[PDB]
Write a protein that binds this DNA or RNA. Sequence first.
RNA 1: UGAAACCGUUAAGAGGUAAACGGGUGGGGUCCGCGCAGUCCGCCCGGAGGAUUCAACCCGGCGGCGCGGUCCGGCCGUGCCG
RNA 2: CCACGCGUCCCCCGCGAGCGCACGGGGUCGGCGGCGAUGUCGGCUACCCACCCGACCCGUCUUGAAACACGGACCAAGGAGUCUAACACGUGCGCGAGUCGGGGGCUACGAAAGCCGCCGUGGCGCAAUGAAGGUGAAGGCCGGCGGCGCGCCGCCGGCCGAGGUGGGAUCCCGAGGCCUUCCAGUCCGCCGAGGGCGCACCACCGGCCCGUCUCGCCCGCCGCGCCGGGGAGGUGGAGCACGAG
RNA 3: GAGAAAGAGAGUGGCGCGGACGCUACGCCGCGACGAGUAGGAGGGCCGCUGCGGUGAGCCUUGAAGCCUAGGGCGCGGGCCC
Lengths: 53, 52, 187, 147, 124, 225
Amino acid sequence: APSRNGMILKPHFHKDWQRRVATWFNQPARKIRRRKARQARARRIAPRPAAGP
Amino acid sequence: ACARPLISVYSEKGESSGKNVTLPAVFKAPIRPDIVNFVHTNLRKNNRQPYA
Amino acid sequence: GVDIRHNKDRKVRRKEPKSQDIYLRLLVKLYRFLARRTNSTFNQVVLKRLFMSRTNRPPLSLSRMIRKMKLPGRENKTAVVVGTVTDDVRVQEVPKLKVCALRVTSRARSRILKAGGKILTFDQLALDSPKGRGTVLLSGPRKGREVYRHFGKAPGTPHSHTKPYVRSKGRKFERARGRRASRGYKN
Amino acid sequence: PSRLRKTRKLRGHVSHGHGRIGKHRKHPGGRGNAGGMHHHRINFDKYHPGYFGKVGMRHYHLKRNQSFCPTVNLDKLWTLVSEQTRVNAAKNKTGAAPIIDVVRSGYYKVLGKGKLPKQPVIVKAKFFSRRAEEKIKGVGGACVLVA
Amino acid sequence: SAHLQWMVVRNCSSFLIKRNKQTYSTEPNNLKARNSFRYNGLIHRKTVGVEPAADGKGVVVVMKRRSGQRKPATSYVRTTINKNARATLSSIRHMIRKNKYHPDLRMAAIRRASAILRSQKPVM
Amino acid sequence: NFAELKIKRLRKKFAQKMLRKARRKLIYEKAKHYHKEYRQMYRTEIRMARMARKAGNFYVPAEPKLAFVIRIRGINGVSPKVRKVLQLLRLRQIFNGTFVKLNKASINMLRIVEPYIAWGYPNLKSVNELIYKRGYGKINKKRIALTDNTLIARSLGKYNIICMEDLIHEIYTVGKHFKEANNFLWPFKLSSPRGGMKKKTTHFVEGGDAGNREDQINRLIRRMN
RNA sequence: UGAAACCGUUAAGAGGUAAACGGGUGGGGUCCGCGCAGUCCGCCCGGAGGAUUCAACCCGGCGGCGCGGUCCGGCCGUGCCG
RNA sequence: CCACGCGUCCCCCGCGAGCGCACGGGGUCGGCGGCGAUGUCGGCUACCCACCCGACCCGUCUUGAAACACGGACCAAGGAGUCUAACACGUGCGCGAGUCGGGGGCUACGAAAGCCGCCGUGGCGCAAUGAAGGUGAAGGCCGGCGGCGCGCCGCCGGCCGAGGUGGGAUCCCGAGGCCUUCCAGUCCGCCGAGGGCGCACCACCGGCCCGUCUCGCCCGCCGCGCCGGGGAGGUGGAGCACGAG
RNA sequence: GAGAAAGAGAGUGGCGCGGACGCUACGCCGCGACGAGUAGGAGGGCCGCUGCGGUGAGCCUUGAAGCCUAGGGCGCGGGCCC
Ligand SMILES: [Mg+2]
Ligand SMILES: [Mg+2]
Ligand SMILES: [Mg+2]
Ligand SMILES: [Mg+2]
Ligand SMILES: [Mg+2]
Ligand SMILES: [Mg+2]
Ligand SMILES: [Mg+2]
Ligand SMILES: [Mg+2]
Ligand SMILES: [Mg+2]
Ligand SMILES: [Mg+2]
Ligand SMILES: [Mg+2]
Ligand SMILES: [Mg+2]
Ligand SMILES: [Mg+2]
Ligand SMILES: [Mg+2]
Ligand SMILES: [Mg+2]
Ligand SMILES: [Mg+2]
Ligand SMILES: [Mg+2]
Ligand SMILES: [Mg+2]
Ligand SMILES: [Mg+2]
Ligand SMILES: [Mg+2]
Ligand SMILES: [Mg+2]
Ligand SMILES: [Mg+2]
Ligand SMILES: [Mg+2]
Ligand SMILES: [Mg+2]
Ligand SMILES: [Mg+2]
Ligand SMILES: [Mg+2]
Ligand SMILES: [Mg+2]
Ligand SMILES: [Mg+2]
């Protein structure tokens, strides 16, 4: 039942979407994990270029 | 305003030293409690763990 | 019993700005005084335009500033918007201007002060001219927003050139039955 | 903030702002965009004309990178290059026109909308409008192509 | 300045208390102790305050000078008046009136000093 | 110095005091001239009736130029054509009164609202005592009671109506600026009638109170205020 | 901690249109006013008092400003120039 | 009789002093009297009782409920427009033809906060139109060269330059004038006949871009072709017409 | 506050040291007219509950939260203070 005026639109929520949802609360946990892994690699290859080849 | 006074530097004994630095222009920025309250509201919601 | 209707009995205007910043309300505290103790009707228009919304204070650009100043008669006259004097980049020459606005874009400030004009704000305008004597009041394009293209007589209706709300402009998105003589009907 | 929302004023009112005669039922007009040609045809033709039907040629594997050709107008042509070039072009008595590579700024095509100020140019582009190149000729200046 | 920091302080100050449909303000240099613009003592350049003395008797009068605005320790000057009730009030009247020092508070300070001295003369 | 600056203050004050005194003598003699005019207006319609009867003819007096309408039926259940005429007569509440000059454009309005109004030809005493007791003024579209002549004179000075008997003369002797003088007057909030109505619903001819009751509107006014 | 419905008992009051309710008072209670000879506050006059007492001066300190028309020295400019 | 003086020409027949009374811009007394320590005073309200008037039980669906309409014995606690996403508009805030780091990276509270700018990739916006190939948003003036039975320019040199009409808040000008004893007489302020430059917006007429149709002639060259460009007049567009996101 | 567009305007020539309240300008004050309401819409709550950042040199074993009350009260009212 559309009202007076507005976009008629297609939300893709007809599937069961609450079971498959990706919450990003580990975003700063990965932004700590990556830089810990990167510092460990940059210590491990000790004079070599830190970015790689 | 426009004027920048000359803010004295204090030694650890409490009394004033001869060092005397001018007041930076940050301390003449406009005072807006609206913008302060708005940014404090929306940023204190960011250190917040979920509950369900 | 009294035979009057009360439908429009409450008039609908603003009498204070809906904003809560303190500098705008100090400008309001100034022009409340300057509007009731002067006989200048400039101060009432400035007081009424300080109340208005962001959409009722559209930005007046610099190439319309200078264009409405290049009219005859209004030489060495200060000129006042209540909104925002933004820069316009499709203009090269800029005359000297005596602008008075609430907030001028930094690039427009550089552009005007390079040309040698000066930028007042409203607490300086009150000291320079309390009755607004020798000013040119201007305003931006109030129908300049794109939401005044979705308004008016509805689409799908003859002689109504209204932009409809379409989620993505293409050849598949509202081109087919109302829009063509071949398929359905044309309006 | 639910503290500011409508439901805090609608406590005690026994219909909660939806009526006693027509109750707030679940889906009275069908779900979604239902009934386009049947019982909401009046809405979809007073407010979304053209919504039903096919038109035009189907182009299967479309790639939005083949048809990349952004445009710039002549009144913002001089906004590509810094102010010192056009100031020195106005000061130069030689007639040395400044060279403006629009592709370096990121516009492939030059269209001509506005008044262009009267000092020469070498505008090099990937495409040109008819009116744009003749405005460049009318100010007196060259239209260099580049691939 | 003064009118910006009044519009900051006016509803957000720790000296403001609001209950029983009455609004007050507990800054130390306030005369009549009420939240207003004239009477608030933290804001202005020039400011009169009336306090009872550190001794049980006497009235100290606080004057904000004009120079050290941002310097709080050397901003307020104290003067102690341990005298009869008439000359205490004439001293406060001469300090506020004849120094041209913020003359709207000229009667409120005399009311406050008269209320301090009544409490300092002994209880019935 | 404050020597000549002092004395020119009371020079200007004495000047406007003498100006006010000249204005009071003006409106005194205007009221006297009005009393003379009303004596002549009352005696000449007796004089001419006598000189008609002395020959044996008849003297038809002039049809009056001034009626006073009163709304005697309430808000509820009003037909809309009857309603709009009452809104143009400014009879909104029950028991409001309004002076109305007569012509063909107005009598055919009054017969549309004949079931709801009682109107007749108000006497000089009626036009006096309505102004003095219940007469207010639409000043700055507010309702200010006519307590002093300046309230009349500031609004109606440009029509040369500057005391209260000027307003009474313009209403009664219906003048050139009757529209402005009457629309100055707020509609008269008359009380409910002492003694009591005869019958609200039927016309005055058939033993009621609605409709034209020509000379008899004064008996209604005397007990409605 | 120990509420409400419900119940026992004590006290008070009442009772033939089931009870209950709104407006209006009246009567009886129960507690409170810490009622139960009723306010103070300025200025003036008179009468008795008691002070280490006011005004004016002198010294010291502190503060404010017809602005010193224009005193000397600083610092700053979201001012300019060399 | 709300009529009071004198002096000057001619028609006609600008500050007097005091007191006082008040049907005068909303009430005062500069008038009084009683009763008060264990039996009395005040307490409108809240406890009980009495009387007169009034008085059907709530929720609900209904044209209409006290209904012989359904729900409800009573009480305590729990108990129903929430959250995510998209969109629309209105509002407040920052910046502004730009804007935004949301993804990544660098350095207890802090899983925050700061920072990047050769991390603006990217989104939205600054350009539309067409099914599509595509095209893609003012012009005007001068001089020369029945082209002659473009007085209308094909191409160049110079110049003006980015509409008009009506209404329009604001402003700008100012014929005159705002008195103190009178005349001349400057400065400041103010009022104002009349006249302008007209914001936003509205209405209308023009103009430009894209599609389409009709009419018609001219121009371009590396390829003179089933090539390319152009004009005039209608008409279709969610356009432009000195940003507004 | 005054029936009449506008200056309580500047210039040149003939003793006693005194004077209430105010103005949280989102404040205070002054006039006028008005007040019905279901479905619904909107505004204001110094109405109420729970938690969080600030703050009250807040309160509290010399007795907080809760609960009861024929006690004193305030607010139209939600409710609240003794
Ligand atoms: Mg609906
Ligand atoms: Mg009524
Ligand atoms: Mg109503
Ligand atoms: Mg309304
Ligand atoms: Mg309701
Ligand atoms: Mg609703
Ligand atoms: Mg229902
Ligand atoms: Mg429905
Ligand atoms: Mg139905
Ligand atoms: Mg629903
Ligand atoms: Mg069907
Ligand atoms: Mg009836
Ligand atoms: Mg009787
Ligand atoms: Mg137990
Ligand atoms: Mg018993
Ligand atoms: Mg009964
Ligand atoms: Mg039902
Ligand atoms: Mg049903
Ligand atoms: Mg039925
Ligand atoms: Mg119904
Ligand atoms: Mg039945
Ligand atoms: Mg049944
Ligand atoms: Mg049922
Ligand atoms: Mg049942
Ligand atoms: Mg909508
Ligand atoms: Mg908006
Ligand atoms: Mg997109
Ligand atoms: Mg109502």
